[PDB]
């Protein structure tokens, strides 16, 4: 269960790295 | 200061606290001086001679009242204050000399002696050799040695304006 | 760091040091300009390369550098 | 020969150089300006001839080398500010 919260660690990494820069470049190209 | 109550206080306390304030002034740690001075109760700061002399000496030093600072050498409410006061007098001699350097487009010697609070022309000559003066060719210490657009810094500031405007 | 076109015009050089006059190439300010249709076509070709979401201030700073 | 900064000529200096008198150096300088060999102005109250340009003169190899060193200094300054502007505006700079 607590190493399932380690699953939550990798979930946090997924939100942080994958989606933030995704939206950033998405809105840049949307301005273009 | 810690063991308030359970203790009857010592009459020497105020004297020794004033001596500590003199020590802090001599070493020129003004922030710590004021911080500890704030520990003394109000009426102790305002009335007790042992706490009045240190604070008054700092007041005179900040104002520039070096005459009264020197007269503190005669005041000395407790004779033990001499040690921490002599070094302060020497530092104040340096500070007064700095004042003389910046001001006094020209100054003579016979009166500069009293200005620097010295009592011997040999001491005057030694001190002039210290740092360096013109010795008064006409008996006057003429230490009257008094563009460049900050283009780089201004360009940095303007680029900062542009970047703060364009990160919108 | 420069335009691709260098324009020259031949002109006789009357040397002040008496050397014989000889034909030489003289530079003339050359720049690239487009008709309306040429601009439309080139903009279509550069639709995905040219960056237009820069801002006037950013473009002018780029011009300065 | 005088540099680009201290190129102010006094009537006494020009008189000594040309073996003329301060009362004729003034006419000489105006004649120079009229013929167009030099550009500048005259302040006779202070007897100083301000100059800003002289006819281009032939240069020797050493003079060309010195001009090259000056050009190197200029190029270093230009490169320094190119780098400064680029680094400071890197974010916005396209």
UniProtKB/Swiss-Prot annotation, chain A:
Protein's cellular compartments: Cytoplasm; Nucleus
Family according to the record: Belongs to the AAA ATPase family.
Subunit-level organization: Component of the 19S proteasome regulatory particle complex. The 26S proteasome consists of a 20S core particle (CP) and two 19S regulatory subunits (RP). The regulatory particle is made of a lid composed of 9 subunits, a base containing 6 ATPases including PSMC4 and few additional components. Interacts with NR1I3. Interacts with PAAF1. Interacts with TRIM5. Interacts with ZFAND1.
Function recorded in the entry: Component of the 26S proteasome, a multiprotein complex involved in the ATP-dependent degradation of ubiquitinated proteins. This complex plays a key role in the maintenance of protein homeostasis by removing misfolded or damaged proteins, which could impair cellular functions, and by removing proteins whose functions are no longer required. Therefore, the proteasome participates in numerous cellular processes, including cell cycle progression, apoptosis, or DNA damage repair.
Protein name: 26S proteasome regulatory subunit 6B
Species this protein is from: Homo sapiens
Whole sequence portion shown: 39 to 70 of 418
Curated annotation (Swiss-Prot), chain B:
Covalent cross-link Glycyl lysine isopeptide (Lys-Gly) (interchain with G-Cter in SUMO2) as placed by the record, residue numbers: 122
Superkingdom of this protein's organism: Eukaryota
Residues of the PCI domain: 1-150
Protein family according to the UniProt entry: Belongs to the proteasome subunit S14 family.
Quaternary structure (record): Component of the 19S proteasome regulatory particle complex. The 26S proteasome consists of a 20S core particle (CP) and two 19S regulatory subunits (RP). The regulatory particle is made of a lid composed of 9 subunits including PSMD8, a base containing 6 ATPases and few additional components. Interacts with DDI2. Interacts with TASOR.
Role according to the record: Component of the 26S proteasome, a multiprotein complex involved in the ATP-dependent degradation of ubiquitinated proteins. This complex plays a key role in the maintenance of protein homeostasis by removing misfolded or damaged proteins, which could impair cellular functions, and by removing proteins whose functions are no longer required. Therefore, the proteasome participates in numerous cellular processes, including cell cycle progression, apoptosis, or DNA damage repair.
Identification of the protein by name: 26S proteasome non-ATPase regulatory subunit 8
Species the sequence originates in: Homo sapiens
Gene: PSMD8
Shown stretch of the complete protein: 176 to 349 of 350
Curated annotation (Swiss-Prot), chain C:
Signal peptide (residue range): none
Source superkingdom: Eukaryota
Covalent link location (Glycyl lysine isopeptide (Lys-Gly) (interchain with G-Cter in ubiquitin)): 50
Subunit field text: Component of the 19S proteasome regulatory particle complex. The 26S proteasome consists of a 20S core particle (CP) and two 19S regulatory subunits (RP). The regulatory particle is made of a lid composed of 9 subunits including PSMD7, a base containing 6 ATPases and few additional components. Within the complex, PSMD7 interacts with subunit PSMD4 through their respective MPN domain. Interacts with TRIM5.
Further comment found in the protein's record: Does not bind a metal ion.
Function: Component of the 26S proteasome, a multiprotein complex involved in the ATP-dependent degradation of ubiquitinated proteins. This complex plays a key role in the maintenance of protein homeostasis by removing misfolded or damaged proteins, which could impair cellular functions, and by removing proteins whose functions are no longer required. Therefore, the proteasome participates in numerous cellular processes, including cell cycle progression, apoptosis, or DNA damage repair.
Family of this protein: Belongs to the peptidase M67A family.
Protein's name in the database: 26S proteasome non-ATPase regulatory subunit 7
Organism this protein belongs to: Homo sapiens
Full-sequence range covered: 131 to 195 of 324
Swiss-Prot record, chain D:
Subunit and interaction comment: Component of the 19S proteasome regulatory particle complex. The 26S proteasome consists of a 20S core particle (CP) and two 19S regulatory subunits (RP). The regulatory particle is made of a lid composed of 9 subunits including PSMD13, a base containing 6 ATPases and few additional components.
Protein name (Swiss-Prot/TrEMBL): 26S proteasome non-ATPase regulatory subunit 13
Keyword S-adenosyl-L-methionine: no
Keyword Acetylation attributed: yes
A Gene Ontology molecular function term of the record: structural molecule activity
Record PTM N6-acetyllysine, positions in chain: 16
Designated gene of the protein: PSMD13
Disulphide linkage map: none
Gene Ontology cellular component terms for the protein in this record: cytosol; extracellular region; ficolin-1-rich granule lumen; membrane; nucleoplasm; nucleus; proteasome accessory complex; proteasome complex
Function: Component of the 26S proteasome, a multiprotein complex involved in the ATP-dependent degradation of ubiquitinated proteins. This complex plays a key role in the maintenance of protein homeostasis by removing misfolded or damaged proteins, which could impair cellular functions, and by removing proteins whose functions are no longer required. Therefore, the proteasome participates in numerous cellular processes, including cell cycle progression, apoptosis, or DNA damage repair.
Family named by the database record: Belongs to the proteasome subunit S11 family.
Biological process (GO), any one: ubiquitin-dependent protein catabolic process
Lineage top rank: taxon: Eukaryota
């Amino acid at each position: 269960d607590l190493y399932s919260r380690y699953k939550k660690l990798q979930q946090e990494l997924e939100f942080l790295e994958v989606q933030e820069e995704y939206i950033k470049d998405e809105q840049k190209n949307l301005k273009k | 200061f810690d063991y308030k109550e359970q203790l009857p206080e010592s009459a020497y306390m105020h004297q020794l606290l004033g001596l500590n304030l003199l020590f802090l002034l001599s070493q020129n740690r003004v922030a710590e001086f004021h911080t500890e001075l704030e520990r003394l109760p109000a009426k102790d700061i305002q009335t007790n001679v042992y706490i009045k002399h240190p604070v008054s000496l700092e007041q005179y030093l900040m104002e520039g009242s070096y005459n009264k600072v020197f007269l503190a050498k005669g005041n000395i409410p407790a004779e033990s204050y001499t040690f921490f006061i002599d070094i302060l007098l020497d530092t104040i001699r340096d500070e007064i000399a700095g004042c003389i350097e910046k001001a006094y487009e020209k100054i003579l010697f016979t009166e500069a002696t009293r200005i620097l609070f010295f009592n011997t022309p040999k001491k005057m000559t030694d001190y002039a050799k210290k740092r360096g003066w013109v010795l008064g060719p006409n008996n006057y210490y003429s230490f009257a040695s008094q563009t460049t657009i900050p283009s780089t810094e201004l360009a940095k500031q303007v680029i900062e304006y542009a970047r703060q405007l364009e990160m919108i | 760091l420069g335009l691709p076109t260098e324009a020259y015009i031949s002109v006789e050089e009357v040397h002040d040091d008496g050397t014989p006059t000889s034909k030489t190439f003289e530079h003339v300010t050359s720049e690239i300009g487009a008709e309306e249709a040429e601009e439309v076509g080139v903009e279509h070709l550069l639709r995905d390369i040219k960056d237009t979401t820069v801002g006037t201030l950013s473009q002018r700073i780029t011009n300065q550098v | 020969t005088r540099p680009a900064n201290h190129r102010q000529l006094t009537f006494e200096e020009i008189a000594k150089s040309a073996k003329i008198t301060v009362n004729e150096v003034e006419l000489l300088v105006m004649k120079a300006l009229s013929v167009g060999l030099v550009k500048g102005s005259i302040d006779e109250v202070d007897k100083r001839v301000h100059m800003t340009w002289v006819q281009p003169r032939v240069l020797d190899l050493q003079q060309i080398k010195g001009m090259k060193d000056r050009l190197e200094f200029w190029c270093t300054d230009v490169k320094s500010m190119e780098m400064l502007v680029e680094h400071q505006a890197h974010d916005i700079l396209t």
